[PDB]
Write a protein that binds this ligand. Structure first.
Ligand SMILES: [Zn+2]
Length: 46
């Protein structure tokens, strides 16, 4: 399909967890906090 990320915004960094865009790393890491601070997940389990 005509899908794609590049559009709404062109940021150098990107969150491989959710998919957020950031201008500077410091910002990205600061966000990852909400990612590296919650119970883990599992495939078709729990
Ligand atoms: Zn994220």
């Amino acid at each position: 399909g005509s899908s794609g990320s590049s559009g709404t915004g062109e940021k150098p960094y990107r969150c491989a967890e959710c998919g957020k865009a950031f201008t500077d790393r410091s910002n990205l890491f600061t966000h990852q906090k909400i990612h590296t601070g919650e119970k883990p997940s599992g495939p078709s389990s729990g």
